Design a protein around this nucleic acid. Sequence first.
DNA 1: GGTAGACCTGGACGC
DNA 2: GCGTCCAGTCTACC
Length: 314
Amino acid sequence: GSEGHRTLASTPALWASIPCPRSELRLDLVLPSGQSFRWREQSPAHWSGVLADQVWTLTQTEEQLHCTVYRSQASRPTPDELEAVRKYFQLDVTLAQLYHHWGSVDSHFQEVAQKFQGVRLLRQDPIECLFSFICSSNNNIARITGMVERLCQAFGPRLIQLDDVTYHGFPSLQALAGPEVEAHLRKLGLGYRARYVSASARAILEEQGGLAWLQQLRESSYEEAHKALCILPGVGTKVADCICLMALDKPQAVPVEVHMWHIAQRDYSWHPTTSQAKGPSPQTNKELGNFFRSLWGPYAGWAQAVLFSADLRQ
DNA sequence: GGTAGACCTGGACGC
DNA sequence: GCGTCCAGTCTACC
Ligand SMILES: [Ca+2]
């Protein structure tokens, strides 16, 4: 009853809602789509994970986003806590308003979007984002998800336990920069990315001015930020774009990888026109990125998530 | 400046 | 059941 992960039905008094139609947000399309790797649908239609340093379970009805927190007297979320949820889902950004625009300038987007409404961008913490995506390179979303989990259990702060799941906060820079972390990460299966994590943790802390250097990018321009991020080991233009798009409030950032190339070719008959090569390459990927920005506008990154997330769904 | 290849790991095809 | 194939960054090099 008071044990295990909650359900809307099971413990009514402990939930609270946030006005939010499914047209504006589809948890099933956002939480497992490779933006964040830390949410799990423990019970059907119920997603649990760490948000704002606490564990939550989220679920929705047609017009409401129901939320619950596990902090010590169990009680429904407070308006201030719920605000953290709205901020995490950037709910002040109107999706219907963005879909309309993208749809009006791109017939193909219009066609596809009709079936995949409610795909928006989560506003993520820079550190988790940086290291989660450092783990994403040349890898599949399933292994990635396993790596990040193991990473947080071994190095992140212990939160609360539900059923047989012990939740952990994402590791701090100090923890990731620690001694023998690389060796430990290799035993956890991160492969060669084990060194990237260790090396980037130290680089940020011992050469770039620490957490402040990263946190200050949310005020810098996309061009600056993206360039700054690329210095870090394991962080290329692609990983840097994901971070810019998902953590540094750069909605125009467009991560170009295999999915996007196939979409460009199949749905837009796109070809590199100024680039040297015909296939993927540093030059062509950059060009592809510009094509989508020019096509979708300032929130091209978000538009990208709609088609991307819809691609995984096939 | 702009290519080729190697690359940890493990669920998937291919056969 | 085995070998090969896939899900970005980095580096040696022409
Ligand atoms: Ca690939």
